[PDB]
Amino acid sequence: YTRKMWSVQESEWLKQGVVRYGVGHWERIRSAFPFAGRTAVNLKDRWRTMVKLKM
DNA sequence: TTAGGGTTAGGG
DNA sequence: CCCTAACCCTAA
């Protein structure tokens, strides 16, 4: 498997998920948007990465 | 099922 | 290259 960078839209979905359902509600956020090929753990890790990059 | 530490691969 | 974002491991 070849790792896949996060698109701007995927990151934006995740940000709106945190707004709508709260940090740590990763499985609810995943089901609220058409994430294709991202697990709830993937979202948790991406959020950590976005926090560090200030997004 | 998520939090947090650890791992690795691919792009800057 | 080699650093770091995208991954993995696992307690609770």
Strand B at less than 7 A from CB of A51: no
- Positions on chain B within 7 A of a protein C-beta: 1-6, 9-12
Query: What distance lies between CA A27 and its chain's CA centroid?
Result: 10
Contacts 24+ apart (CB under 8 A), A36-43: A37/A4, A38/A10, A43/A14, A43/A17
Domain that holds residue A33: 1-55
Residue A14 and residue A51 in contact, taking contact as beta carbons nearer than 8 Å: no
Structural gaps in chain A: residues followed by a C–N separation over 2.5 Å? none
Give chain A's domain count: 1
Number of neighbouring beta carbons within 10 Å of residue A38? 18
**CA distance to A3, A10, A28, A43, A52, per residue, from A24 (Å):** 23, 17, 9, 9, 16
Residue-by-residue DSSP string for A1-55: ----PPPHHHHHHHHHHHHHH-TT-HHHHHHHTT-SS--HHHHHHHHHHHHHTT-
Let me know: does A35 contact A10? Beta carbons within 8 Å.
yes
What resolution in angstrom units was achieved for this structure?
Answer: 2.0
The technique is: X-ray
